[PDB]
Structure formats: C-alpha cells, structure tokens
Amino acid sequence: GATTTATRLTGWGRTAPSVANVLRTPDAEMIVKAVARVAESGGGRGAIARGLGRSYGDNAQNGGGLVIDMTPLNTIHSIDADTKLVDIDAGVNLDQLMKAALPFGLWVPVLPGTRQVTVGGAIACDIHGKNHHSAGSFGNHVRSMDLLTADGEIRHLTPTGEDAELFWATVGGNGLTGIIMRATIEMTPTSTAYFIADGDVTASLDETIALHSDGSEARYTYSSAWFDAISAPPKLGRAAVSRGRLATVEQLPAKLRSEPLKFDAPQLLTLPDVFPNGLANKYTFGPIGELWYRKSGTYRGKVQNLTQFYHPAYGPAGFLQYQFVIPTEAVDEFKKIIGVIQASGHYSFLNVFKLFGPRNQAPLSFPIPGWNICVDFPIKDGLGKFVSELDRRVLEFGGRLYTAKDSRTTAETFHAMYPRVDEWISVRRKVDPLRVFASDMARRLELL
Ligand SMILES: Cc1cc2nc3c(=O)[nH]c(=O)nc-3n(C[C@H](O)[C@H](O)[C@H](O)COP(=O)(O)OP(=O)(O)OC[C@H]3O[C@@H](n4cnc5c(N)ncnc54)[C@H](O)[C@@H]3O)c2cc1C
Ligand SMILES: COc1ccc(CNc2nc3cc(C(F)(F)F)ccc3nc2C(=O)O)cc1
C-alpha cells in the first residue's frame, strides 16, 4: 500500500525538523516513478532516500521536498554459503541480515553500535564498527549495488569496473548519487556466533594510547574502548578496552557446542531494573572502587555472545552527538583535543574510543587511520560555539567530522575536512545535473 504524506522529519538527535513528502511503498517500480516525476520538474526541490533514521543529523530529510522511506523494501533475495554473498534489498536492516545469515555460518562484515540501520544507510554513510582496523568500513564489502539515478535508470555498480567512480561516490555519498535499491554484500565466514575477548583497564590517556600503540592491536580483529572524558588529568582518558576475535567451535564451552551459531542476547535483565537507584556505594570513588573496576575489566580469553562483547544517556534538553577522527601520527594534538573537552565544562559520560585502520577510496568516506572519538554533550548554554571551536581544532589537526552524526557544522569547515569533496561533487554533477537528489544536509554543507 503506497502512501505519500507530509511528515515532520528529524534525525536521531531529534533536532532541526523539516516537513517533507514521505513516499512509503514496497513497490520498486513506484519508487522509480517518483524519481522520474521529480526529475521531470527539472529538479524541483528534490528527493532523498531514508532508511531507519538512525543518523543524528539532517542527511535523511528534505524540507519542502520528497523523502522516500526505503524500509518496506526489505527482501532478502538470496544467501550463498559457498560464495559468501547476500543479495538484499536496500531496506533490509543489519539485525535482520545477521539473524538470517547465521544459519549459513556468515557474519555481517561490518556492524555499527546499533543493529537498526538499513543496508542503504550502511552504504550511504560507509559505516564503521569495532573491526575497522582489520576489516575496513561497510563500503569495502559491497561487491555490487543497483543505483536508481536522476535519469530514472537503474545503474548496476561494482567496486572495480567502468562505473567504479560512481560506486565510490555512492559509498559515503549520503544518498546524493541516487537511491540504492539492491546490493550484493560479501560476508565474513564464521563457525560461531561468539567472541573470544580480552579486557584491559588503563589508568590514564597516556596509558590508553600506549596500549593501542604497542602492537597488540594487530592481534585482535575487533577493538574499542570506553574512556573517561570528565575526570581531570591524569585520570582523563583512562579506558575500559574491549578487544577480541570471532570464536571457533572448539573454543566454546561444551554446553555451547550444540548450538554454535545460535543467537541469545536477549533478557529483561537490565541494571536499571535490578538496581533502580544506582550501582554506587561507599567504595565506588575510592581506591577499592578503582581496584574493583581494574580487576573486573581485566580478563583473558572470555567467551562472549554478541551483546556482551558488542552491545553493552537521557536528558530533557536533548543531546549533541559529536564524532571525529584525528590522524594516527598527530597523537599530541589528539591528547590536546581531549584536554580541551574535559576543561570545557561540558560533560560526556558515553565515550567511544577506537583506533581506525587504513581508509578506502571513497572520497567522502569518514574513516581515516587514527584516533576515533564519539562524545555525548547534553545540550546547554555555550555548547554550539564550543563545538565550533572543536571543529576548528579537529580540522587543524587533519581530522574530520562524521556526517552520520553531524547536524550543526558549516559548509566551509566540512569542505576543508574533506579535501576530496570537489572530486566527489564533480561526480555528483555528472550523475545528477538537475539536483534531483537533495537533502537538508546537502544544502547546509553545500554538497547540492
Ligand atoms: C545508537 C546508534 C549507534 C550508532 N553506532 C554507529 C557505529 O558504531 N558506527 C557507525 O559508522 N555509525 C553508527 N551510527 C550511525 C548509523 O550507522 C548511520 O547513521 C546510518 O546511516 C544509519 O542507517 P539508517 O538506515 O538509519 O539510514 P538513515 O539514517 O535513514 O539515512 C542516513 C543516510 O543514508 C542515506 N540512505 C538511506 N537509505 C538509502 C538508500 N536506500 N539509498 C541511498 N541512500 C540511502 C540517506 O540519504 C541519508 O543520507 C549509530 C547510530 C545510532 C543511533
Ligand atoms: C544508551 O545506550 C547506548 C549505549 C551505547 C551506544 C553506543 N553507540 C555507538 N557506538 C559506536 C562505536 C564505534 C566504534 F566502536 F568505534 F566502532 C563508533 C561509533 C559509535 N557510535 C555510537 C553512537 O551512539 O552513535 C549507544 C546507545
């Protein structure tokens, strides 16, 4: 049942709302007609694909134009265990795909912090995960994709070939090269749905960095950390590092050998429920509390399912998610940014720390080799201007912001952060001269 309706659309950050016509149809031919309709106007105010709206900013909204909800196109066409390939519509989400692929011994090669993201969304933001340093981003694993272009045609793209340029423009392209309808993804072979994990707790930022620089990182396919962004030096940047690899069946305890590829993360066992009024006691902030934490977070060869290894903040004024990457070599500059954040008087509790590996050939891809950080700032006075200063520091240190998180950065800052934007822009103008594809972000970041 195809429907088009005016909808107030915000990203996950629940900010910068705009009203657009949301076309929601499970018919692929209907989607082609809409694009053909918009392109007939010679552009109009454009259209933009929307997945599960998990992006924090304004890349999946188009104020005064068209938004096409891709989530109804959620057919898994095929999964092959021999070729490791999945042929799926763009609307299928990674949780669905993970659940469907496990009985084949196939693993989603790149998984984000949440599993409620579409294949289209995964490609369009070139998403990264705990395994980036060893697997790359989501783009690295796409063997083909079908792109609906401005001309109303469906172009079949491959990473290497005669349409390679448009392929890598679409990777990290934020839906601005057209609409991904269908994609073939190569999966990661696995014999279990489990991880072999090693945990380490560090005392400071220096120690967290030394751990990631000592070579141990090459021993783990998956690696991420939670760090302290509020405590003053030297406690600043202390981390609970979580590193590991996917497990083989023999590495499992005998009671788990029966169902190696079974998934079992789910319980009503949530800590707010068991403990309504907190984890803290009289030891928590003293030397015993720090001892407890150090020993608890330090372990070797622990068998963990998906949620315990991979999936372990509320306020009235909303939050500001802020993610950036500083080049590997610029270590001192990275420490300086962290120092600035803790001295800001803006307090972040959920802090993701990860060292990214080698980057791909997508000119708009976010990840570069270096120190990746996500911080959550409660919205309060002076935040916007503070993060503009961070923007300046990130840019100055060869770093960039991530489109999947941004809602407020300027076009100038962004263009300087992405030195290959002119090249990307040139591909976009070839494939969409009329600006048939448009979004709030495109207009804000001057990518239109
Ligand atoms: C709790 C949480 C944790 C997260 N963790 C991570 C993480 O660890 N790593 C990471 O990289 N990201 C992470 N993200 C961000 C997320 O991976 C991206 O925002 C992703 O794009 C969301 O996919 P979506 O289906 O919601 O797409 P949407 O948010 O709906 O759309 C985002 C962009 O994708 C485009 N798009 C969507 N569908 C299509 C299509 N069919 N064809 C063409 N373009 C399309 C849109 O035009 C838009 O520009 C996280 C987000 C949340 C809320
Ligand atoms: C309140 O519940 C929670 C708890 C933890 C998370 C972690 N989410 C995230 N994990 C991330 C993990 C990475 C990593 F680890 F580097 F791959 C990168 C970005 C990430 N971004 C996010 C995000 O929030 O956008 C999200 C919600």
From Swiss-Prot:
Function: Component of the DprE1-DprE2 complex that catalyzes the 2-step epimerization of decaprenyl-phospho-ribose (DPR) to decaprenyl-phospho-arabinose (DPA), a key precursor that serves as the arabinose donor required for the synthesis of cell-wall arabinans. DprE1 catalyzes the first step of epimerization, namely FAD-dependent oxidation of the C2' hydroxyl of DPR to yield the keto intermediate decaprenyl-phospho-2'-keto-D-arabinose (DPX). DprE1 is a highly vulnerable and fully validated tuberculosis drug target.
Regulation: Is inhibited by 8-nitro-benzothiazinones (BTZs) such as BTZ043 and PBTZ169; BTZs are a new class of antimycobacterial agents that kill M.tuberculosis in vitro, ex vivo, and in mouse models of tuberculosis. Is also inhibited by dinitrobenzamide derivatives (DNBs), which thus block formation of both cell-wall lipoarabinomannan and arabinogalactan via inhibition of decaprenyl-phospho-arabinose (DPA) synthesis; DNBs show high activity against intracellular growth of M.tuberculosis inside macrophages, including extensively drug resistant (XDR) strains.
Subcellular location field: Periplasm
Gene behind this protein: dprE1
GO molecular function, one term: oxidoreductase activity
Result after altering residue 374 to G: Confers resistance to BTZ043 and PBTZ169. Loss of covalent modification with BTZ043. Decreases M.tuberculosis cytotoxicity in macrophages
Cross-referenced Pfam families: ALO, FAD_binding_4
Effect of residue 374 to A/S/T: Confers resistance to BTZ043 and PBTZ169. Decreases M.tuberculosis cytotoxicity in macrophages. Does not affect binding affinity of the substrate to the enzyme, and only slightly affects catalytic efficiency
E.C. designation(s): 1.1.98.3
Membership in a protein family: Belongs to the DprE1 family.
Additional remarks: Was identified as a high-confidence drug target.
Record: residues binding FAD: 49-59, 113, 118-121, 125-128, 180, 402
Pathway info: Cell wall biogenesis; cell wall polysaccharide biosynthesis
Catalysed reactions, as listed in the record: trans,octa-cis-decaprenylphospho-beta-D-ribofuranose + FAD + H(+) = trans,octa-cis-decaprenylphospho-beta-D-erythro-pentofuranosid-2-ulose + FADH2
Keyword ATP-binding: no
Effect caused by changing residue 374 to N: Confers resistance to BTZ043 and PBTZ169. Decreases M.tuberculosis cytotoxicity in macrophages. Does not affect binding affinity of the substrate to the enzyme, but reduces catalytic efficiency by 4-fold
Gene Ontology cellular component annotations, sorted alphabetically: periplasmic space; plasma membrane
PROSITE patterns in alphabetical order: FAD_PCMH
Protein name per the record: Decaprenylphosphoryl-beta-D-ribose oxidase
Subunit (UniProt): Monomer. Although forming apparent dimer in crystals, DprE1 does not dimerize appreciably in solution. Interacts with DprE2 to form an epimerase complex.
InterPro entries: ALO_C, FAD-bd_PCMH, FAD-bd_PCMH-like_sf, FAD-bd_PCMH_sub2, FAD_lactone_oxidase-like, Oxid_FAD_bind_N
GO biological process: arabinan biosynthetic process; capsule polysaccharide biosynthetic process; cell wall organization; cell wall polysaccharide biosynthetic process; response to antibiotic
